[PDB]
Symmetry: none
Amino acid sequence: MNSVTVSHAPYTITYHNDWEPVMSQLVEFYNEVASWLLRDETSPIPDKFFIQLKQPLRNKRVCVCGIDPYPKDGTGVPFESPNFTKKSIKEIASSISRLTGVIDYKGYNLNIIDGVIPWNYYLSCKLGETKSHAIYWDKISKLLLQHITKHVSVLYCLGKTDFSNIRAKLESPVTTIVGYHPAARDRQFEKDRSFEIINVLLELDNKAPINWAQGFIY
Amino acid sequence: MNSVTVSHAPYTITYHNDWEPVMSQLVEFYNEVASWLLRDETSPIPDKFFIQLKQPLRNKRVCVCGIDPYPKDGTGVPFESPNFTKKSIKEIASSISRLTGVIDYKGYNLNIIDGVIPWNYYLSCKLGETKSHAIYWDKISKLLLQHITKHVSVLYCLGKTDFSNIRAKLESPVTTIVGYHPAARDRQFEKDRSFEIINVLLELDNKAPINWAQGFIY
């Protein structure tokens, strides 16, 4: 694992070699915007912005993408809630509980599932303000997601309003599903069948399915 | 059913009201390119270019799409071979035979199946030359398929090279599967499960399945 330097906090970014082709562009873009975004208190903290760049991409076939980190308590790992309190990962875990039949569990983590890379489109938000740093991450976000979609075969985005312009933004040939947000009203995420549709699409493309039960913590 | 006039052959285009929102753009685009198309002898003939615009779209949930008409003997109805001689429709018929269990039949037509709209991406070719009018239909082809994908739940494209970047060019939320071309080598179309999976995907989207046996002619 290499690292590069940036002018502002967190000053160094360590990354898995799979990310190498985008890193010089990332440094340039981050140096342009970091001084502005860092004036706000952020979720996650600056030292955690880029920790997901330590994940390999070549063993990944599905990206599960939310728009930005949790308003509060972001860890730098997308969707991760160590104490299992965040609504999104609780609703996701319930959806997978119904799919797989596993009813007794203490937590759920999208970051421990073979073939899945969980992702936050924007890498920070001003503390307590969802989507507040969209203007800063803009170009970086497109750069990094485009790079992810060169490896994965299915991109699954959560939030129809959040990602209403994602296909025009990405100009990608990759299969893209935009489902309901886990906190969508009228219980619409509970009736969402995107987790099931992903595996059907993978198996048609001669890829192994995702074992969604791997995410459970007991 | 309304009609609209164009400057060149076939001079008048009759269309089902479901197509209304794209027809003013179509006449504009066709008037720009029709002279280029019409210098060549074509499959189909100019009076058959647009007959598929007589099909309604609101009762359609699957589009089955090939890149252009048969190099010769195109009827204006995509995939249609009245005498059942064309390799593509014969291979399709054979795949649907293995799926449904119907073994005795004289022909197959994708244009007589409830919920299915068969489609040719480019609406003509120079006689005997596949993809020879790609450049002329370009913008019309994008316009018309984008309109189809606002109505249908599943877009099934045949030909992995032909349709490699179709999802990028469409920027559509429709479920798109790109399978082998019926005449592909190493029996790759015979082993293609796409027709089978269409109904699995429709059920997941709370849609009725396709009765593929409706296409058979006895």
